[PDB]
């Protein structure tokens, strides 16, 4: 009945075009899964079912979850379900993981999420009817099918920074926030703290072991960058998450199963929590996914020692903070997406294993991981280590 | 707990640039969706989590499921996550739901399926990083993301005309099944047996009521058409399920929601199972599917009143009979997808429907629903009528 | 010196995606390439240089004139090269041709030109480079390197619009040019005035092209009741404007001492040729100063002149050459225009050459003058007479 | 009327998405022909006719010579032709020009060519009906019209290397008539010898504006590894990246004017063009047209190998120069004497007209009267030019 998460990996996040881009979200998938297999103290052929978010599916070919689980050297006899809930796409996989457990549908399964932001291809809506006469249109399929609202065109960054404005949050404040979670990203890199959430990729050859992008920003530069979204804005490309290429997996078992197999898991989850509101405040529904999260544990924030709420935009974490009273002291502590990018898929698996690896590293036990996401959606999860 | 399918809803099927082509997937989802909520006899604001299937969801933009949701006069507050298992999306979005249920996450969801093949975009693979020099392919999404395996680019056609060669079925053989798969929907609709699951599509504004690819059909010249996938091969546009457009929606609970709602549902899943296996031999999962299924549940092919089994392939509902000694005059009674179509994204779900519609009409009680997957996969759901 | 045309064929000009939608402008070109050749009473290798003129070359492959060339049956030995002077490309075709003959290059050349905007593809910009992030533009090659204009991005008939404002002519002036153009152009087809400069084109079952497409599917009833085509209050439509079309043409031209050595007749004359270069704005008019300056050059007045081909483009650029000259309708595009029949950007200019000969032939005159209208803002005019 | 080279320029060779890559084809043009107008002591006004070699024309918008002229400056009274005869554009441009000068139609006229092979743009040629189901193509314009046999597709390295196999021509000749091209290309960069025939382009970057006054590929070439480059057009050939020309951006352009004109006007001109002849034969033959082009030149002119002091003949591969020189019995330290092609590049649409530039400027600086320019072209053929300094 409890369900606990036995391992898990994460791939380095590359920059755009950057140190991914030669690598298909399904080979960086394939690697996480692999990885987390490995650690998790059994064979690929006990995995009962693989469940991978990833947001940006066009061009990936036939069933990328499937041919993610085939490449990380899972058999043919573990079933493969894709999922896509935006940037969520990687909690709502273990959230689902966590029920077909309780269920009794299954009893290891692999949950986790992939993006290659670098790879997603462009489309032409009117190729196959045609175009007849007049100039036409070829759409970026990461804009289209991601990070733009459907019914009003209107990239997520411009409803974030309408928010922003009616909380009276500032360039200057969304700045400092920024700056602060690219030193903590710098110093997880450089004192070897991330190592043990991370495996290594190989790419005529090279091995990319560290997140690219806190080890190229320019911190002198930040306050002097031009509004990204909206002309004399305040949101900018370095207090906004950056596009980004990563996967992330878990394997989650019941507590029985773990026991079974002699197994000494990482962590149990408390509980998970999911909050549903208008697009236009998708960078609020964090707070409400953590207030239904609480209700439903018995926790308190009181009872919780570290947060991940991802970092989406500098705006999401610090009104996040304010409106549920938290210190900066015990939320991302090692940076996170303004610092790192945002892997749509994967962040939300991903956030999971970087507040294991503190936990473990800074002497907590309870967490609670949270991210909003496009469409007005956010999810939280409630982590205690054992 | 009891999980029971309350109510439910299909679009007609449309052909290839069809009847439906004027109308996206979403709008096929949210027709779909609005019309089994309304049969459920509950209130949009009631619906708590929707699941929908969508293997093509280039040139959709962002959260298919949420934009088909929000545009059935769902609120902002029912959350939605979209899935890909290939053919199996619909069947899989019941499965999850269920799994959920059991699980004690929802009391109400809907789920179900929603494809518009005929508005599958084209997509342009390195245009974004740069051709450089030299000549490159514009990819059919519909043929690169779902119909061809990933591995070898085979269309999974080729694949059914291997597999029907080396089990010896002959084109006379795969002919016969489907000119009577061909009368029985045709038979059906004259009949007005499909008009209590169907929901009527509007696209002058004329109404779409009937599936059209079983009416427009040349059963005459079924056995003079030209193989399809091999010059001597024996699979044809007509013994291989055409392209089509479509959605279908469920609306789940607990046993103990629909009793405190007053509610009488339709029917009880008794249990689901998937099989996976070489994506070369995906026409056979279904086999294996409906085996872990009797063993899941204790229940023999002699319970089995009416199955509802896809005919993504003659030969896979020939082959699924043979080894399981099944009946025809019991199996896809009024027709099935070698007549209809094979909207990939809906018909895992729509078969649940049509096998729930045929046992109220027919008068059985306890019935099987299979479809294979591409990737080597199949699903299988035990239905039993209330 | 003596500079003449002895024989010439022109397709059928076919609708946009209408009759010759299945057939490339290297094969339109071939088909009007080979009968020229034919109707000449020459051999293949008697051809020493083609200049073919072709405005839209995107994915026509390697150099659209030498394969017309070849598919029309001339050997490897004959030079091709294609040139693009919009509109006029075909026109200017004949001139070069003209020029290179009298200055002792050849004694025996083929010119014309060829155009399937049918067939015209779609361009995509920063696909090499790279699109990197954003929504981008697929461009119509027809549009882009054709039809708008390259500074402003406004399209021909938008310039052509302000200009028939600015010399008063009205929507029904406008509209009753073209029912005559569109009645003369049935007529002809009808009773058979046009056969004798057309070769048949066969398509793929298998069928052959022999009339114009587009004046045959011309609604008459409609024209007065038609929108603005340029501008929102315009008096220019599809219908007094000329439509996009498939087709081609070609002549054999000589020195007239070529001719008379080969012991053959001629069908005309070049007394001789002008261009008239101004303001893009201003194209509508470029042929009122391309005819002045051949009246100059030749020493004829309009007077002399039994028969006219003024191209279509609008049917003010007609009307407003025929007003600044003061030329009678009658003896103008007497089997009508591109109004009813399209504009083959690249073959016009060289085919009203071949009906010009043909109408002073059958009507039976003497001295005529093509000359049309060039997107850029330029024009060509040809003097012509029968032998 | 005899026919006289006034004045000419042309712009630094840009390799393949390099130096030049941020100007059109037309701003090339454009750059070009003012400066030549300038050098040739006209006004803009005076020039009444502009022919433009240009290949790829794809994606430069309505009428490449007519914007390239009314950028340059000259205005809209001056007449405008873009022609194409592959990589003899700027060559025919220049004919035609004589032609039409010979024949009376202008006494004052501007020839050349240009492409920019970096912006050449990609064709879909099934969109304008559609795709309808399955996977179509998407076209390099570079390839599909300039680059490739229409009737078969090949690649024009892919006949250069079956030539080439036929004569039985060794990497090892190849690549020492490549390493002497570079070598002169190098010498005349670096001791100021282009200079005369260059107007410099301005460019952008996010540095800001620079000035491009030097061919690039000469300066950015490995001498060392040309013996170690992989073949380009079979698995075990002998043509490469360094023996065969490069992908190039650039334009030329030359004011022609009858003898009299320039006269009349007491301007100097550069030289007399003696006469012009063609070669055409099967296209799997284009590397060999030069070698007739240049006997029917001499048909043409009454002149022999003899009477020329200098050859241009252009590098499309090194095997080119290299058969002409060997048939028609030349010495090497009279042909491509400040390099070519190999070491430059090939902007397919301006080398037919800049080197006429070259070979002119050469004439001057390295002594003599009388030159010879040829090329090979696509589709087989080959156009040559007799002139004369003055």
Redesign the interface.
């Given at each position: 009945s409890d369900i606990v998460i036995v391992a898990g990996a994460r791939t380095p996040m590359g920059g755009?075009?950057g140190s991914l881009?030669g690598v298909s979200a399904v080979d960086l998938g394939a690697v996480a899964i692999r990885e987390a297999v490995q650690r998790a103290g059994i064979a690929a052929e006990d995995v009962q079912?693989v469940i991978m978010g990833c947001v940006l599916?066009?061009?990936?070919?036939?069933?990328?979850?499937?041919?993610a689980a085939?490449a990380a050297g899972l058999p043919?006899?573990?079933?493969?379900?894709?999922?896509?809930?935006?940037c969520g796409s990687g909690m709502?996989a273990v959230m689902?993981a966590?029920?077909?457990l309780?269920?009794?549908?299954n009893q290891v399964m692999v949950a986790g999420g992939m993006e290659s932001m670098?790879?997603?291809?462009?489309?032409?809506?009117?190729?196959?009817?045609?175009?007849?006469?007049?100039?036409?249109?070829?759409?970026?399929?990461?804009?289209?099918?991601?990070?733009?609202?459907?019914r009003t065109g209107r990239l997520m960054g411009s409803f974030a920074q309408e928010t922003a404005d009616k909380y009276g949050v500032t360039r200057e404040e969304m700045d400092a926030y920024a700056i602060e979670s690219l030193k903590r990203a710098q110093a997880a890199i450089a004192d070897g703290s991330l190592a043990a959430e991370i495996v290594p990729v190989t790419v005529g050859e090279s091995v990319v072991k560290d997140d690219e992008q806190p080890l190229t920003a320019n911190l002198e530069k930040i306050p002097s960058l031009r509004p990204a979204f909206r002309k004399d804005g305040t949101i900018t490309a370095a207090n906004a998450s950056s596009?980004s290429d990563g996967a992330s997996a878990l394997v989650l078992m019941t507590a029985e199963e773990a026991q079974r197999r002699g197994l000494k898991p990482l962590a149990r989850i408390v509980g998970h929590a999911?909050?549903?509101?208008?697009?236009s405040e998708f960078t609020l529904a964090p707070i409400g996914a953590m207030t239904n999260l609480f209700a439903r544990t018995g926790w308190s924030k009181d009872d919780v020692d570290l947060f991940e709420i991802n970092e989406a935009f500098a705006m999401v974490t610090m009104l996040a903070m304010r409106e549920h009273g938290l210190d900066h002291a015990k939320v991302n502590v090692y940076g996170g997406a303004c610092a790192q990018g945002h892997p749509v898929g994967s962040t939300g698996s991903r956030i999971i294993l970087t507040l294991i690896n503190a936990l473990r590293q800074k002497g907590g036990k309870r967490g609670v991981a949270s991210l909003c996401i496009?469409?007005?959606?956010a999810t939280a999860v409630a982590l205690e280590l054992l």
């Open positions: 755009f075009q881009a079912e599916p066009a061009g990936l070919k036939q069933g990328p979850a499937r041919q085939l043919a006899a573990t079933g493969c379900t894709t999922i896509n809930k935006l709502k689902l966590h029920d077909l309780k269920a009794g549908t670098s790879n997603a291809p462009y489309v032409l809506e009117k190729a196959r009817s045609g175009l007849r006469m007049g100039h036409g249109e070829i759409k970026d399929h990461m804009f289209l099918d991601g990070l733009e609202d459907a596009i999911t909050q549903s509101q208008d697009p496009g469409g007005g959606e």
